[PDB]
C-alpha cells in the first residue's frame, strides 16, 4: 500500500503454536539443553549425552502434534475435522442439515363414493415414485401434512398437496433427565420434525414455521454431539414458566419423536406419481400432474447429503453477522442458504433503487434454470417472518447466460475400454464439474481453456480438444425487449446474433391438398444484425418477406441491400425489414418489432434464442447475471464429436 | 436491502485561525515635562556639550 | 480527527494574519457601529507587604468577572486611544549600527532602515525611505545552519548567513517594476517611503510604523507612490506586502487630566488596562444611554463595568507623580 500503517495480515495463525519440522527442534533443544543451563556434567557419555537429546526430541515433536493439535480445532476458521467444525457451529445458530429429502406439489383429481364435502387427507398418505433413470423401483413418498379439498360441480376433488421423500418413524421414550435423548440413524433432515412431548405442539427454537409471537415455554433445541447422530434436550425451566427458559418434561412423560427416513438425493427425477392410496371411500382418480404450476420443469428438487467442509465455514461465521434476521443484502444470502438452501445454488439478493421496497433475490436451483412455484412462495414465506417488516422479498430469478460449445475431444481407439457412450458420459459430468466448481457462482468468469483442460482430463485416452463457442441469452417476452437491456457485457464480434427459428400466421389462405385448407402457417422468419458502421450503428431486421402482409406506408420500404445483413435460407424473398439499433461498442441490443408495424398474432410462440458468438475468448459476466452450463434439463445445445485416432 | 443508498459529499474545513494573539509585549516610559508653570528647579544636570 | 482515511493540508498563510488585523482597526471610528477604545489605570492598595522591589511579582490577573469587578473598585481614570494613536509596527533592522550585535549581514528576507542615522546616511531630502527589504543572499559564502553548503539548500533547508559583507546598501528610490541591486548580490526590493515627520514621531528606538491602506489609496507621493507599477496590481494598501502582522496602541497619561490622584504620595499600584465602548453616568439610572466619547473620563460616570474588559496587566509600583506624563505601550500580534 502507501501508508505502511496498513499492512496488518490476515486471519494468522501466529509462530506460538505452528509445530516442529523435526531438526529445528533437535536446534532449539540442544542450544537451550546445551547452553544457557547446563555445560554439560551428564554422565552418560560422549556420545550418549548427545544421542539422549533426541530420544527426548521425539518426546517433543509428539507432544508438539498431539496436544498442539487441540487449538487448531479449538477455533473455527483454522480447523479441521468436520466434528469439531460442526460443533463449534451451532452456538453461531446454524446447524448443518445432515441431509435432505425430495419435495413436490402435486394436485391430486380423486373423488370419494360418499360425496361428502370437505374431504380430508392425512398426513402420510403412502406414494411411491420412479425418480426416473429408466424405470425400474419405486422410492417413496409422504404428503406429511393435512390440506383438505372441495367438491364443485362435477363430483371431484383437488387436494393439492406437498410431500417429502422417506417414510416417517416414530420412537416413543421416557425422559430420565439424567438421559440425552438421540436418534442414531444417519439421516433425519432437521427442517421437518415434530416431536410432539404427550399433548401436542412442541414448535421448537432453532427452527421456526411460524415464529408465534410471545408463547414463551415449549421450545425444544436440536444440536449434534458429533457423531453424526442428533441430539435432542429441554431449557433450564421449572413451571412450579418460572421466569424464562423451556417448559421442560415433567421427570417422566411420552417424548413422541417423528421423523422422515428420507433415503437420499438419488430421487431428484421425480416425473411419474402412483397413488398407493388406502384410506376410505377416496378413489385415488390419478390424472396426477406433477408439475401443474409454470414453465419447465426439472421434476423434485433437493435431496441433499451433507454439506461439505468448505460450505459449513463461510456460512457458520457470516451467520454471527447475523442474529437470526436478515436486515442486510448479504443476510437474505445467508438466509437462502442451508436453512432453505439445496434448493438453492447461488444467490446475490439486491435492491433496485427505482422500485423501493422490494428485495430482489435471484437464485438458481441445483436442479438447473427456473425454481418454478411453490417452490419459491416456500421461499417467501421463511424469509418475511424474519424479514424487515415493510419490505417484502421477490424472486426474480437471475438472467442466465448459457454457452454454446461444439467440441471435440478426439480420443485414441487403442487406449480405451468403456469407448463411446461411458466416455461421452465421462466428459460431460467433467465439464459439469467445472461449472460447479467455478464459474457457478456469480461475478466469476470461464475460460474455455479451463474448461477444456478438465476435458482432457476425462480418463487418459482422449489427448487434445478443441471447441467453438457461442453465448446463448434468450429472451423472454421477445417482440420489444425491455428498455437498454438485453445485454451480453461481451464484445459481440459483429456479423452474429444469428435469430432462432420464428414462423407466420396468416397470408391469406393459401388451400393444400387432402383436407379442406391450412393457415400458411409455414414460411418462418429469423433476424440478423448486420454490420458495424461509422461507429456503432449496425441496425438490425426482422427476415425474410415474399410480398404482401406489412404496413410499407412511408417509413419502412423494407431494405438493408444485398450486402451483409445474411439471408435465411428459403425462397424467402428477400426484402428485409429494419428494426433496431444494436450498439456494438457498448453492448446494446433493441428490438421493438412495432417499428415494422406488425401484429403479434402473427408470431408463433415467444422466448426465443439469439445466441451471437464473442469476440475474445473468455466470457465476462455482471450486473447478476449468471453463466452456467446444465445440460440434463436442455440438451438443444450441447454437441460433442468424438472422432477418434488409430496409431 | 430495500432503501435506494445514494452517495454525496460534505467537506469541514476547520481553520485553526486565532493562534497567536500574545499581546507581546507592553511598554511605557515616563516624560519630565514642560509647561509655562515650571517654576524653581533644584540644582540642574547635563544640559549641553 | 486522527489518523483519518483522508489527509488534508491547509496553511492558513501570512495574511490572514494580518488581514484579520486590519478590519480591528478599519472600524475604530465614530458613531454606535464603530467601538472605540479606551485604556486605563491603576490600583492604590500597596499591594503587599515586600511591594517595591526586583524580586516578586504581582498576582497573575484572572479573566474570571471576580477579576473583573476589582479592577472598576481599584481603578482611577481612563485616557482614551484615538484611531490615529495606534499604529502597526516592525522589528526594524538597519544596517551599519555598531550598537546592534550584527552591523550588516541581513540574511534573505529582513527588514532594513538607513538613512536615519550618522553611520547610514544617503541622500537625504527624503529623510528614512529604506524600508525595502532583501531579495536575494550574495552568491556564495553561506554557511547555513546544516552540513549540506552552496546556493541550493535555502530549499531544503534554513537561512543563509552570507558571510561576506555589503558595501553601499544605499539605493535609488528603485528600478522599474522589480527593484535595485546595486553591489554584489544583496539584491533589494523597496518597500515604501516613511516621511521624515511620522518618524520622528511614531517611530521609536524599537519598531516602526507602516501607513494602512485608506492612507495611501487616498494619497500617494507623501508616502511616495506612483513609482510602484505594481501598485495598480492589487489596489494600493500594502500593509500585506510588508506583513505587519502586529498592532500596538499607545496613550498618553498626564497627571493634568487627573489632579486627584496625583498628588504628593500617590503610588499607582498595578492594574492597568484596556476596555471597549463605555457608556455614561446615566444620571439616574433609567433613561437612554450614549456612547463615551470624551477623553480621560474618570472612574465614575462610567456605569460600573460598562463595555468589556480585553486586557489586563499588573506592574507592581509605576510612579505617576505630577507633571511627568506617563506614555504606555501594548503591543498585539491579531
Known sequence: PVNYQLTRTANAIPEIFVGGTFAEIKQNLIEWLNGQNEFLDYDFEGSRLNVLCDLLAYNTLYIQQFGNAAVYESFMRTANLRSSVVQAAQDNGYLPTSKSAAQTEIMLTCTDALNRNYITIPRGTRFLAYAKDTSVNPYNFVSREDVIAIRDKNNQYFPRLKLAQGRIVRTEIIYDKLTPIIIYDKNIDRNQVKLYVDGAEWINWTRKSMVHAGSTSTIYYMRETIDGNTEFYFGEGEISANYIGGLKPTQNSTIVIEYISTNGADANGAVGFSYADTLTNITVININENPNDDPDFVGADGGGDPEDIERIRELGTIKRETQQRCVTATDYDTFVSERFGSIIQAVQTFTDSTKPGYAFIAAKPKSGLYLTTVQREDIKNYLKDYNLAPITPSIISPNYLFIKTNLKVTYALNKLQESEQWLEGQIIDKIDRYYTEDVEIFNSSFAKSKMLTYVDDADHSVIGSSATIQMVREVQNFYKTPEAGIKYNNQIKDRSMESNTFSFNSGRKVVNPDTGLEEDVLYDVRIVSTDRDSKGIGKVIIGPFASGDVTENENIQPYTGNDFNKLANSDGRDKYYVIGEINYPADVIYWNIAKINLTSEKFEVQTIELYSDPTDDVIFTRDGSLIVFENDLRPQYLTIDLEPISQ | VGFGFIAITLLTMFINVGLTLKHTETIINKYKNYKWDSGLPTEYADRIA | ?334
Not at chain 3, 45 to 63: I, K, L, M, Q, R
Not at chain 3, 165 to 178: F, H, L, Y
Not at chain 3, 289 to 309: C, F, I, Q, T
Request: proline share 8%; glycine share 6%; with cysteine.
Open chain 3, 1 to 334: 480527527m486522527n489518523d483519518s482515511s483522508v489527509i488534508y493540508r491547509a496553511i492558513v498563510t501570512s495574511k490572514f494574519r494580518t488581514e484579520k488585523m486590519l478590519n480591528f482597526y478599519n472600524s475604530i471610528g465614530s458613531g454606535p457601529d464603530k467601538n472605540t477604545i479606551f485604556i486605563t489605570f491603576g490600583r492604590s492598595e500597596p499591594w503587599s507587604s515586600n511591594e517595591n522591589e526586583v524580586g516578586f511579582a504581582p498576582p497573575y490577573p484572572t479573566d474570571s468577572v471576580l477579576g473583573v469587578t476589582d479592577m472598576w473598585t481599584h481603578m482611577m481614570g481612563t485616557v482614551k486611544v484615538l484611531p490615529s494613536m495606534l499604529d502597526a509596527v516592525i522589528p526594524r533592522r538597519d544596517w551599519g549600527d555598531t550598537r546592534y550585535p550584527d552591523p550588516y549581514t541581513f540574511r534573505i528576507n529582513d527588514i532594513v532602515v538607513c538613512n536615519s542615522a550618522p553611520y547610514n546616511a544617503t541622500e537625504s531630502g527624503a529623510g528614512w525611505l529604506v524600508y525595502r527589504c532583501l531579495d536575494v543572499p550574495d552568491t556564495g559564502m553561506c554557511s547555513i545552519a546544516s552540513l549540506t553548503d552552496k546556493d541550493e539548500c535555502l530549499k531544503l533547508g534554513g537561512k543563509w548567513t552570507p558571510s561576506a559583507r555589503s558595501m553601499t546598501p544605499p539605493e535609488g528610490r528603485g528600478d522599474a517594476e522589480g527593484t535595485i541591486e546595486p553591489g554584489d548580490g544583496y539584491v533589494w526590493e523597496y518597500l515604501f517611503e516613511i516621511p521624515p515627520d511620522v518618524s520622528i514621531n511614531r517611530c521609536t528606538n524599537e519598531y516602526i510604523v507602516v501607513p494602512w491602506p485608506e492612507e495611501l489609496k487616498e494619497d500617494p507621493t507623501r508616502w511616495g507612490y506612483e513609482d510602484n507599477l505594481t501598485w495598480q496590481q492589487d489596489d494600493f494598501g500594502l500593509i500585506y506586502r510588508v506583513k505587519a502582522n502586529t498592532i500596538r496602541f499607545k496613550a498618553y497619561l498626564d497627571s493634568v487630566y487627573f489632579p486627584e490622584a496625583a498628588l504628593p504620595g500617590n503610588k499607582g499600584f498595578r492594574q492597568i488596562s484596556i476596555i471597549t465602548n463605555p457608556l455614561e453616568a446615566k444620571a439616574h439610572p433609567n433613561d437612554p444611554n450614549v456612547k463615551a466619547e470624551k477623553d480621560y473620563y474618570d472612574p465614575e460616570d462610567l456605569m460600573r463595568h460598562s463595555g468589556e474588559m480585553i486586557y489586563m496587566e499588573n506592574r507592581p509600583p509605576i510612579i505617576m507623580a505630577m507633571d511627568q506624563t506617563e506614555e504606555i505601550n501594548i503591543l498585539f500580534t491579531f
